[PDB]
Design a protein around this ligand. Structure first.
Ligand SMILES: Nc1cc(Cl)cc(Cl)c1
Lengths: 115, 113, 115, 113
């Protein structure tokens, strides 16, 4: 139900080995760690959760873009790219969170499908 | 030293009356809110800080995109758009944070001079 | 070797049934029709060419974004989204041309892989 | 009535000295070039046309992105970025064509007032 895809707009390639941390907001308001992983050679990260665990809630996906650029010798603008959204408010959906990275810019898009 | 500009990709216009909150990261790793405003008729927000107060640090700019889309009667995906950056790491700079908004996508860019 | 993917940034979905026309620039400078098709239910168009036909050259991918919006009742800004690029200049590559559509904006990205 | 603004997503700056050519579609479906310029130190190009000459029609704005990246020593994907639009269909408007450039990606947006 949740996939993250990261692309590099400088090289026109997948952004490989990008760390991603996902959090869910608890009923106390705090950000509870929910899942993490790193992007594969295709720039994708699958397997973060399951339909049953991925309940309604407010989720945050934090993509460690700074470390990605630093490893390429670049000092980028952003510390990270953070995507915050309410999920499954009108029933279960599949979410693809895509990010397109440049040193001084990022774009993010959600593709939401009803399986 | 800090300006925010917001555009609406649906209407082809400045995004007017968008709330923007700015925070500085505190020593305890919490976000200390210290400036806010809303975008003008040109989609711009000026006057958030001054040269003397805008010292090196990590800053967060939160743009209340959800409220903007709700006011237009359009279903949005994100809660907000957040920009987090280390400022002034090599000297004081002028920063323009530009955001281009769609209901299920946004982009943000920094123009640093 | 050539795939086109189109997404709708208003609904967070694939842009389905989008017409795409591909042209190649001839040695006379004119744009020669090369391939066409329409995006599937996943927003993707595959099967446009083959490794052997997709020689070095300058290609244009024209995505009929206006008709897509018009069918949704919208009068968009752009007539189309046109992506023009030199292909295979340093040997055969696979190209994914992605476009992200809004009524008054579009983004386009190339992912280029070496198989 | 027509301004072009170009930003560089790699450097976090205006894209300076970028060539821009504007064309109007002719009755024979050919593109008739009629204005050009290059972006200023602020990434902007003003003064392309006037209210009287900018009549309804289909216009193309071609931004020479390839030359810009070559001048920076960066390998680019696209030949150029092209924006094609019908102008003034509902009255005269002011158009700002904004482009945000990366070597393998670009976005373009219209701000129409
Ligand atoms: N001014 C501006 C233009 C585009 Cl096309 C994208 C972004 Cl983030 C800003």
């Amino acid at each position: 139900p949740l996939m993250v895809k990261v692309l590099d707009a400088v090289r026109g390639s997948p952004a490989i080995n990008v760390a991603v941390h996902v959090f869910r907001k608890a009923a106390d308001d705090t950000w509870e760690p929910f899942a993490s992983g790193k992007t594969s050679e295709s720039g994708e990260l699958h397997g973060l959760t399951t339909e049953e665990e991925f309940v309604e809630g407010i989720y945050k996906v934090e993509i460690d873009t700074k470390s990605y650029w630093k490893a390429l010798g670049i000092s980028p603008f952003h510390e990270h790219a953070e995507v915050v959204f309410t999920a499954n408010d009108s029933g279960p959906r599949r979410y693809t969170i895509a990010a397109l990275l440049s040193p001084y810019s990022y774009s993010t898009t959600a593709v939401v499908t009803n399986p």
